[PDB]
Amino acid sequence: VYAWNRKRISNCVADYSVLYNSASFSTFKCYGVSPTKLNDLCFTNVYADS
Amino acid sequence: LQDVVNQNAQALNTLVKQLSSNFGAISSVLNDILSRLDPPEAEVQIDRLI
Amino acid sequence: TNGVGYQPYRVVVLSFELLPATVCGPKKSTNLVKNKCVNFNFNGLTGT
């Protein structure tokens, strides 16, 4: 956790509905966006911290 | 006459500029908030904007 | 043996920022139309 994996995400056609409907995640908490209506929304780049 | 015309124009311009204020919300434009937020949070932001 | 309060949990955090769009989701594009009041979605910018 003190050396969390950092990933750059860009240049994709990324579907997030499959992640929401997977139901294998105990917690899915989103701030600034909604779990739904996010497929048609996009930004310049994505940062992933694991 | 120039002074009263300028006063009216300044009031209109001030209203137009004030239309682009966040008012404590995440964004100053309503379309982005509507397209980004779920109905409850979007409702709160619209309340603040109104 | 650890309970739900101490069991391991894998966490991924996704962060975005708005400062041209490069990665966009699975929204099918539509042919451009002019000279009529229509709804447009340009890189996530929604307007009419």
Curated annotation (Swiss-Prot), chain B:
**Where, if anywhere, are coiled coils annotated?**
2-46
What's its job? Subunit of the fusion protein that is processed upon entry into the host cell. Mediates fusion of the virion and cellular membranes by functioning as a class I viral fusion protein. Contains a viral fusion peptide that is unmasked after S2 cleavage. This cleavage can occur at the cell membrane by host TMPRSS2 or during endocytosis by host CSTL. In either case, this triggers an extensive and irreversible conformational change that leads to fusion of the viral envelope with the cellular cytoplasmic membrane, releasing viral genomic RNA into the host cell cytoplasm.
Per its record, how is this protein called by name?
Answer: Spike protein S2'
Report which part of the complete sequence is shown: 948 to 997 of 1273
